[PDB]
Design an enzyme around this catalytic site. Structure first.
Site, PDB file in Angstrom:
ATOM      1  N   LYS A 201      -7.630  -1.678   2.602  1.00 42.58           N
ATOM      2  CA  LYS A 201      -6.188  -1.783   2.790  1.00 42.58           C
ATOM      3  C   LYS A 201      -5.908  -2.679   3.988  1.00 42.58           C
ATOM      4  CE  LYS A 201      -3.124   0.200   5.259  1.00 42.58           C
ATOM      5  NZ  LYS A 201      -2.297  -1.034   5.316  1.00 42.58           N
TER       6      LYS A 201
ATOM      7  N   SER B 296      -4.802   1.159  16.385  1.00 38.49           N
ATOM      8  CA  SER B 296      -4.431   1.824  17.624  1.00 38.49           C
ATOM      9  C   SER B 296      -5.125   3.180  17.742  1.00 38.49           C
ATOM     10  CB  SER B 296      -2.916   2.007  17.716  1.00 38.49           C
ATOM     11  OG  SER B 296      -2.446   2.884  16.712  1.00 38.49           O
TER      12      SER B 296
ATOM     13  N   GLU C 156     -12.752   1.447  15.405  1.00 35.98           N
ATOM     14  CA  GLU C 156     -12.607   0.377  16.388  1.00 35.98           C
ATOM     15  C   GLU C 156     -11.157   0.403  16.866  1.00 35.98           C
ATOM     16  OE1 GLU C 156     -15.098  -1.020  17.542  1.00 35.98           O
ATOM     17  OE2 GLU C 156     -16.655  -1.299  16.018  1.00 35.98           O
TER      18      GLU C 156
ATOM     19  N   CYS D  94      -8.249  -6.949  20.397  1.00 35.03           N
ATOM     20  CA  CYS D  94      -8.817  -5.702  20.903  1.00 35.03           C
ATOM     21  C   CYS D  94      -9.493  -5.887  22.259  1.00 35.03           C
ATOM     22  CB  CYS D  94      -9.806  -5.118  19.887  1.00 35.03           C
ATOM     23  SG  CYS D  94     -10.834  -6.313  18.973  1.00 35.03           S
TER      24      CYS D  94
ATOM     25  N   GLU E 187      -2.329  -0.734  27.729  1.00 34.99           N
ATOM     26  CA  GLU E 187      -2.860  -1.933  27.088  1.00 34.99           C
ATOM     27  C   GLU E 187      -1.733  -2.936  26.841  1.00 34.99           C
ATOM     28  OE1 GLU E 187      -4.809  -1.310  23.377  1.00 34.99           O
ATOM     29  OE2 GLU E 187      -5.467  -3.405  23.202  1.00 34.99           O
TER      30      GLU E 187
HETATM   31  N1  LIG Z   1       6.165   5.428  16.379  1.00 29.35           N
HETATM   32  C1  LIG Z   1       6.294   4.464  17.472  1.00 29.35           C
HETATM   33  O1  LIG Z   1       6.625   4.838  18.577  1.00 29.35           O
HETATM   34  C2  LIG Z   1       6.008   2.990  17.213  1.00 29.35           C
HETATM   35  C3  LIG Z   1       6.818   2.040  17.739  1.00 29.35           C
HETATM   36  C4  LIG Z   1       6.564   0.713  17.518  1.00 29.35           C
HETATM   37  C5  LIG Z   1       5.462   0.336  16.736  1.00 29.35           C
HETATM   38  N2  LIG Z   1       4.655   1.280  16.210  1.00 29.35           N
HETATM   39  C6  LIG Z   1       3.508   0.876  15.391  1.00 29.35           C
HETATM   40  O2  LIG Z   1       2.203   0.571  16.314  1.00 29.35           O
HETATM   41  C7  LIG Z   1       1.445  -0.232  15.604  1.00 29.35           C
HETATM   42  C8  LIG Z   1       0.867  -1.432  16.516  1.00 29.35           C
HETATM   43  O3  LIG Z   1      -0.552  -1.362  16.523  1.00 29.35           O
HETATM   44  P1  LIG Z   1      -1.418  -2.048  15.285  1.00 29.35           P
HETATM   45  O4  LIG Z   1      -0.486  -2.487  14.166  1.00 29.35           O
HETATM   46  O5  LIG Z   1      -2.184  -3.234  15.795  1.00 29.35           O
HETATM   47  O6  LIG Z   1      -2.507  -0.972  14.686  1.00 29.35           O
HETATM   48  P2  LIG Z   1      -2.101   0.383  13.799  1.00 29.35           P
HETATM   49  O7  LIG Z   1      -2.331   1.619  14.667  1.00 29.35           O
HETATM   50  O8  LIG Z   1      -0.647   0.309  13.328  1.00 29.35           O
HETATM   51  O9  LIG Z   1      -3.150   0.452  12.477  1.00 29.35           O
HETATM   52  C9  LIG Z   1      -3.309  -0.725  11.731  1.00 29.35           C
HETATM   53  C10 LIG Z   1      -3.729  -0.337  10.285  1.00 29.35           C
HETATM   54  O10 LIG Z   1      -3.757   0.970  10.152  1.00 29.35           O
HETATM   55  C11 LIG Z   1      -2.632   1.364   9.060  1.00 29.35           C
HETATM   56  N3  LIG Z   1      -2.023   2.671   9.356  1.00 29.35           N
HETATM   57  C12 LIG Z   1      -0.969   2.905  10.164  1.00 29.35           C
HETATM   58  N4  LIG Z   1      -0.721   4.229  10.157  1.00 29.35           N
HETATM   59  C13 LIG Z   1      -1.612   4.826   9.351  1.00 29.35           C
HETATM   60  C14 LIG Z   1      -1.818   6.155   8.980  1.00 29.35           C
HETATM   61  N5  LIG Z   1      -1.144   7.435   9.323  1.00 29.35           N
HETATM   62  N6  LIG Z   1      -2.803   6.482   8.141  1.00 29.35           N
HETATM   63  C15 LIG Z   1      -3.606   5.512   7.653  1.00 29.35           C
HETATM   64  N7  LIG Z   1      -3.409   4.199   8.015  1.00 29.35           N
HETATM   65  C16 LIG Z   1      -2.415   3.858   8.859  1.00 29.35           C
HETATM   66  C17 LIG Z   1      -1.771   0.404   9.101  1.00 29.35           C
HETATM   67  O11 LIG Z   1      -1.065   0.198   7.769  1.00 29.35           O
HETATM   68  C18 LIG Z   1      -2.639  -0.850   9.377  1.00 29.35           C
HETATM   69  O12 LIG Z   1      -3.180  -1.315   8.228  1.00 29.35           O
HETATM   70  C19 LIG Z   1       2.333  -0.812  14.507  1.00 29.35           C
HETATM   71  O13 LIG Z   1       1.913  -0.428  13.316  1.00 29.35           O
HETATM   72  C20 LIG Z   1       3.756  -0.237  14.812  1.00 29.35           C
HETATM   73  O14 LIG Z   1       4.547  -0.020  13.537  1.00 29.35           O
HETATM   74  C21 LIG Z   1       4.908   2.612  16.431  1.00 29.35           C
END
Ligand SMILES: NC(=O)c1ccc[n+]([C@@H]2O[C@H](COP(=O)([O-])OP(=O)(O)OC[C@H]3O[C@@H](n4cnc5c(N)ncnc54)[C@H](O)[C@@H]3O)[C@@H](O)[C@H]2O)c1
Ligand SMILES: NC(=O)c1ccc[n+]([C@@H]2O[C@H](COP(=O)([O-])OP(=O)(O)OC[C@H]3O[C@@H](n4cnc5c(N)ncnc54)[C@H](O)[C@@H]3O)[C@@H](O)[C@H]2O)c1
Ligand SMILES: N#Cc1cccc(-c2ccc3nc(-c4ccccc4)cn3c2)c1
Ligand SMILES: N#Cc1cccc(-c2ccc3nc(-c4ccccc4)cn3c2)c1
Ligand code: NA
Ligand code: NA
Ligand code: NA
Ligand code: NA
Lengths: 489, 489
Positions: free
Chosen positions: B186, B240, B262, B296, B393
């Site tokens: 995915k 993240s 990672e 990263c 970060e």
């Molecule tokens: N809730 C908040 O406070 C907040 C605010 C702004 C942004 N965000 C999110 O932080 C993230 C920024 O970091 P990043 O995008 O580089 O890494 P990420 O942590 O979003 O992960 C990246 C991958 O993991 C997938 N993923 C996300 N949530 C998942 C889940 N519960 N289960 C399985 N897979 C999941 C994503 O579709 C993506 O493919 C963004 O996705 C953003 O939408 C959160």
């Protein structure tokens, strides 16, 4: 010269072991450990909880801090220390077996010639590994120097069950210590005595304070405190599958600590037509009825090929008749009492379940008397996949016997489970032996034997029977973090 | 002759990849992928959900079933298949670099000469490993024969982010495939194009259908369906730390699937007085401002020794001003736009946090212009541990610079974090270099360089920065299950 039983020797170590010192509970609470045979209370042990776990974790962090005596040691010297602990264990071998039998009701001979034997061997093996834990130097580019170090993961918590209290404990302490970690251990509530005696032995052997701390207590109190502690880097759990999921998700939720899990399994046993029927039946009898049938490697399913099915069943019933059941300290006994009441209750309940689903019975099916927790060796026949006796981990004396025709058939059936700890195959045919060994989704595949455990060979579960491995060189991977060092010139 | 950018090439693969076939989402819904620089919509991609992942997992389970073409393949033949995939990747290298840069706003030269380079090298490396994945034969007893097989773990789900969409995908696909697994991947919602094009290439190279399936979509729908699927044996996540905790605990709750993580890290940069200040400044500038600071391994803290602190700050500021920032397809640009709107917003928000918490500023501190999502390279000074720019970060163009005096001091300060992905040390002293390399709780320790990644060298995080390792031989451990076979005679 088989040693005679230590009749009535008193307990000495019952407090919380931290920094090589014995402590009372923060709360002062204490719990009682009882004898599965006497059905009466053995003694009282300090009951730790979150504060005691905090203290032990702090001690382990200080013993692991850079520049500590433990860190500064030689690899060869850590090995020597493990050898010292093994020597002490052997000196006090009978005392430890006596404590083990008092706490678990296991036959004193079993504790002397199995638990302590494995403990000593595991200690010796991983002691040998201490100065032989080597990383890599990696080819990359002409101007670069790239290599890997295998470093200790840090503070390691260990959580162990009641079936083999000390042995499951050695399996974690030995590899974790030879890699230079520090530990917070928690024995089961039912059987904390051997662990505390081993703590005394650790102190005597000369381990620096804080390297190994022991906090007895209950699963939801001390266990939960360890599994979600923010300053524990690694956790190793051996127990039921459900609590294993609980621990792993607590580790995920707290600080992403690495997790080793040794869980249960619907361990199949496969008898082929060309088997040595005598050895096959004997080993299946053992794998179903040893240690009262309460070990992680219990054979719950027994596939026999039609050509010998009936004969196998007959011989099985025969072998079940001549099985000693009596006093655990009795030199002619093979089976002691159960652990507590719930296991006995549900074992009889599922025997009754099986007899009501269409399985022929030929042996036992009840309790001897009401002096302890003894069950008569049971043998079922004409069992199917769809029966509960063929799909639920039994954890007791009962031998459900199913019938198969094909190799591919038995492969599909045996693998249909969600577990994958062990499997046993009995056959004289080279091709069938190897094909089955290849195809079984099982962490260990015995062939023409059972319960063949070796410190040199890795033990662990496929699928929902575990995550990492214990024993062998492989155990080392669960107690080290790999660091890459890349230098440009 | 370096190729110029493919100006306006249309997208072609935007659907769900299963059994080498392209499918519309079961639901029919679709989401949109946009260009972070042009600010205009790139294309529409199928939005899969739990049903789509179930279909993909069924495809992968059948492709992994015993006797399937994929299983029956030779180790060397799996290696050749991976090599064919690498050849195809190289043939369509410019198309892929264009897709990645359009999707992510990454400088096209960076994507062509870094991303695709690492992808091809990773494919070649793990292709080489395929027929060299060997277990052990173990000494035990005169009558015993003991050995171990390293088998495929089964179905592997991969979840990868937007910073390096194709590379982070290869890092998982290569080792998973060379070990004979099947996969459900995915890509991130932001950047699924390269993954689908790679699926087209996967089909072309000759992989049996079902070996690699790709379902684009959002994290909580398709990602959660993957992480907690009961028929997924392994999960590999890059993203993240919080989502990583969520994924690992869902794996714990579902079926105890193994997990590689990672995650992020407060990647420190340690400059000693005896460093090659020029090289130190250049490599720290790169490690903090490369790929728009959204990788990263971004250097978020920069410890400088007092003897060179001020001069370092000066040269760093000066170097940061003269850094091209413009069109990603422009051949003379080093920094493109940001990732999306939320990241740009929060990067500027923490720039304001840093200037408002007491850090001297010398570069940028605002948005360059509104033609895309560009920020001017920022450089902060006189920052301390307790400031937000030094504890969160950054993931953007910002170089917080702290001051230290002792080796032990900088070690304790750098290690005070909960992360441990990478660290960089710049010094000409053998003893300081090696002592720091040993003491830093970091998965990778560069010395006199930065971002020195090699397919042969394992990459991963200490502490809360990850669990397993990618790249190198070590990655293989994450995609194999150890089985012991013990034969008595
Ligand atoms: N809730 C908040 O406070 C907040 C605010 C702004 C942004 N965000 C999110 O932080 C993230 C920024 O970091 P990043 O995008 O580089 O890494 P990420 O942590 O979003 O992960 C990246 C991958 O993991 C997938 N993923 C996300 N949530 C998942 C889940 N519960 N289960 C399985 N897979 C999941 C994503 O579709 C993506 O493919 C963004 O996705 C953003 O939408 C959160
Ligand atoms: N699932 C059920 O509904 C059910 C039914 C009957 C009996 N039981 C009980 O399950 C237990 C199985 O015995 P077992 O020792 O073989 O496996 P176990 O799951 O009880 O674990 C054994 C070890 O893990 C510790 N532990 C238990 N729960 C923990 C937790 N949440 N967190 C951290 N550590 C924990 C225990 O203190 C012990 O040291 C018995 O106590 C039994 O009475 C449960
Ligand atoms: N560590 C450990 C540990 C713990 C419990 C039991 C065992 C164990 C189990 C089975 C076993 N067979 C032999 C043997 C000896 C001679 C000839 C053939 C076989 C030794 N054996 C040790 C090891
Ligand atoms: N796998 C992989 C991967 C992915 C992304 C980048 C890189 C990467 C990063 C840095 C790097 N320096 C060199 C090099 C070449 C010649 C002489 C000296 C050094 C190669 N290099 C590859 C590797
Ligand atoms: Na007890
Ligand atoms: Na293989
Ligand atoms: Na020094
Ligand atoms: Na360290």
């Amino acid at each position: 010269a088989l040693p005679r039983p230590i009749r009535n020797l008193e307990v000495k170590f019952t407090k919380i072991f931290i920094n090589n010192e014995w402590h009372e509970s923060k709360s002062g609470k204490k719990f009682a450990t009882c004898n599965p045979s006497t059905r009466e209370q053995i003694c009282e042990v300090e009951e730790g909880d979150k504060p005691d776990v905090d203290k032990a974790v702090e001690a382990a962090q200080v013993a692991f801090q850079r520049g500590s005596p433990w860190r500064r040691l030689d690899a060869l010297s850590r090995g020597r220390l493990l050898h010292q602990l093994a020597d002490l264990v052997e000196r006090d071998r009978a005392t430890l077996a006596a404590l083990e039998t008092m706490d678990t009701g296991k036959p004193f001979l079993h504790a002397f010639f199995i638990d302590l034997e494995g403990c000593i061997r595991t200690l010796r093996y991983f002691a040998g590994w201490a100065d032989k834990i080597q990383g890599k130097t990696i080819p990359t580019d002409d101007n670069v120097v790239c290599f890997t170090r295998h470093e200790p993961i840090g503070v390691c918590g260990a959580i162990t069950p009641w079936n083999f209290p000390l042995l499951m404990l050695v399996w974690k302490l030995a590899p974790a210590l030879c890699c230079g970690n520090t530990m917070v251990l928690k024995p089961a509530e039912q059987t904390p005595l051997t662990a505390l005696y081993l703590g005394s032995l650790i102190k005597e052997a000369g381990f620096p304070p804080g390297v190994v701390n022991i906090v007895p207590g209950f699963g939801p109190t001390v266990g939960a405190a360890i599994s979600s502690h923010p300053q524990i880097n690694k956790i190793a759990f051996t127990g039921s599958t459900e609590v294993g999921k609980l621990v792993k998700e607590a580790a995920s939720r707290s600080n992403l600590k690495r997790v080793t899990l040794e869980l249960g399994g619907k361990n199949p046993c496969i008898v082929c037509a060309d088997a040595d029927l005598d050895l096959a039946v004997e080993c299946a009898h053992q794998g179903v009825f040893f240690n009262q049938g309460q070990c992680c490697t219990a054979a719950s399913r027994v596939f026999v090929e039609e050509q010998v099915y009936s004969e196998f069943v007959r011989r099985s019933v025969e072998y079940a008749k001549k099985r000693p059941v009596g006093d655990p300290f009795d030199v002619k006994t093979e089976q002691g009492p159960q652990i507590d009441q719930k296991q006995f209750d549900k074992i009889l309940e599922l025997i009754e379940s099986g007899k009501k689903e269409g399985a022929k019975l030929e042996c036992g099916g009840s309790a001897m008397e009401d002096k302890g927790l003894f069950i008569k060796p049971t043998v079922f026949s004409e069992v199917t996949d769809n029966m509960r006796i063929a799909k639920e981990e039994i954890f007791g004396p009962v031998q459900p016997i199913l019938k198969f025709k094909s190799i591919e058939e038995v492969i599909k059936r045996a693998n249909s489970t969600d577990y994958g700890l062990t499997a046993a195959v009995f056959t004289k045919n080279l091709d069938k032996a190897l094909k089955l060994a290849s195809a079984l989704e099982s962490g260990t595949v015995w062939i023409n034997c059972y319960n063949a455990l070796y410190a040199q060979a890795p033990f662990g579960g496929f699928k929902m029977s575990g995550n990492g491995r214990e024993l062998g060189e492989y155990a080392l991977a669960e107690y080290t973090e790999v660091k890459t060092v890349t230098i440009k010139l």
